[PDB]
Swiss-Prot record:
Every PPIase cyclophilin-type domain range: 10-175
Annotated protein name in UniProt: Peptidyl-prolyl cis-trans isomerase 1
Organism: Brugia malayi
Disulfide partners: none
Parent-protein residues present: 1 to 177 of 843
UniProt superkingdom: Eukaryota
UniProt lineage: Eukaryota, Metazoa, Ecdysozoa, Nematoda, Chromadorea
Biological role: PPIases accelerate the folding of proteins. It catalyzes the cis-trans isomerization of proline imidic peptide bonds in oligopeptides.
Length: 177
């Protein structure tokens, strides 16, 4: 409810086994409670296994399978690891919450989707403002530290499917104080 209700979460990322650093994000629980809760639970793994997939609901070990130079990096697919998988802690996908937050600045954390009301576990971190994505993707967080590890990942050499050649893995993830 209050701005003091905002939680912090972390992602320790490795590129081909070499530690790139830590990405810390502040979740706007007071503006997008369901989306932030889903994300926070996926970082800690404290919600169990997927209802439909029967797989662990948590980012540990998953990758950033898509990076777009000058725009964003995408991850969160813990079931298929290529953009076709992932699952929310609510079972399957969940509805879009009110589009309060906007892509009005770089390093905003937003939900990836496959059309209206199709939120799962996939997300993306932008690197420039993107107002055209407003009212399509639910913004629920902001990177507060480690924005340089985000750009490091973003500029990695990719193939024609926009997939990084190197293995970008979430070594550790969880909650911060």
């Amino acid at each position: 409810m209050s701005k003091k209700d905002r939680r912090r979460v972390f992602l320790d990322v490795t590129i081909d086994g070499n530690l790139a650093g830590r990405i810390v994000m502040e979740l706007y629980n007071d503006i997008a409670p369901r989306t932030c809760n889903n994300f926070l639970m996926l970082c800690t793994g404290m919600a169990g296994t997927g209802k439909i997939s029967g797989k662990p609901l948590h980012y540990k070990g998953s990758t950033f399978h898509r990076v777009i130079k000058n725009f964003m990096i995408q991850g969160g697919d813990f079931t298929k690891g290529d953009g076709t998988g992932g699952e929310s802690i609510y079972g399957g996908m969940f509805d879009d919450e009110e589009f309060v937050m906007k892509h009005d600045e770089p390093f905003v954390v937003s939900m990836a989707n496959k059309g209206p009301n199709t939120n799962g576990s996939q997300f993306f971190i932008t690197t420039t403002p993107a107002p055209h994505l407003n009212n399509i993707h639910v913004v629920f967080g902001k990177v507060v530290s480690g924005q340089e590890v985000v750009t490091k990942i973003e500029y990695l050499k990719t193939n024609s499917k926009n997939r990084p050649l190197a293995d970008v893995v979430i070594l550790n993830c969880g909650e911060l104080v």
